[PDB]
Curated annotation (Swiss-Prot):
Homotrimer; the homotrimer forms a propeller-shaped Piezo channel with a cation-ion conducting pore. Heterotrimeric interaction may occur between PIEZO1 and PIEZO2. Interacts with PKD2. Interacts with STOML3. Interacts with TMC1, TMC2, PCDH15 and CIB2; the interaction may be part of the MET complex. Interacts with MDFIC (via C-terminus); the interaction prolongs Piezo channel inactivation. Interacts with MDFI (via C-terminus); the interaction prolongs Piezo channel inactivation. Piezo comes from the Greek 'piesi' meaning pressure. Expressed in numerous tissues. In normal brain, expressed exclusively in neurons, not in astrocytes. In Alzheimer disease brains, expressed in about half of the activated astrocytes located around classical senile plaques. In Parkinson disease substantia nigra, not detected in melanin-containing neurons nor in activated astrocytes. Expressed in erythrocytes (at protein level). Expressed in myoblasts (at protein level). Pore-forming subunit of the mechanosensitive non-specific cation Piezo channel required for rapidly adapting mechanically activated (MA) currents and has a key role in sensing touch and tactile pain. Piezo channels are homotrimeric three-blade propeller-shaped structures that utilize a cap-motion and plug-and-latch mechanism to gate their ion-conducting pathways. Generates currents characterized by a linear current-voltage relationship that are sensitive to ruthenium red and gadolinium. Conductance to monovalent alkali ions is highest for K(+), intermediate for Na(+) and lowest for Li(+). It is found in: Endoplasmic reticulum membrane; Endoplasmic reticulum-Golgi intermediate compartment membrane; Cell membrane; Cell projection, Lamellipodium membrane. It is linked to Dehydrated hereditary stomatocytosis 1 with or without pseudohyperkalemia and/or perinatal edema: An autosomal dominant hemolytic anemia characterized by primary erythrocyte dehydration. DHS erythrocytes exhibit decreased total cation and potassium content that are not accompanied by a proportional net gain of sodium and water. DHS patients typically exhibit mild to moderate compensated hemolytic anemia, with an increased erythrocyte mean corpuscular hemoglobin concentration and a decreased osmotic fragility, both of which reflect cellular dehydration. Lymphatic malformation 6: A form of primary lymphedema, a disease characterized by swelling of body parts due to developmental anomalies and functional defects of the lymphatic system. Patients with lymphedema may suffer from recurrent local infections. LMPHM6 is an autosomal recessive, severe form manifesting as generalized lymphatic dysplasia. This is Piezo-type mechanosensitive ion channel component 1. Belongs to the PIEZO (TC 1.A.75) family. Residues 30-59 form a coiled coil.
Length: 61
């Protein structure tokens, strides 16, 4: 067990690397989700506006 625990500290920096990588991956996943959501909002917003313009021109006609 001396061996096991001596090298647990030797591979603790690798543990930190693994941790940070996983956390960053999850954070980027959430960022992607939020990016998609904002883009969806923009797509929808444009449909709403385009209609309110087909109806605006319809009023003119």
């Amino acid at each position: 067990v001396r061996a096991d625990l001596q090298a647990t500290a030797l591979l603790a920096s690798r543990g930190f690397a693994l941790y940070n990588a996983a956390n960053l991956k999850s954070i980027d996943f959430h960022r992607r989700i939020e990016e998609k959501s904002l883009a969806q909002l923009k797509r929808q917003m444009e449909r709403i506006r385009a209609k309110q313009e087909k109806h605006r021109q319809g009023r003119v006609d």
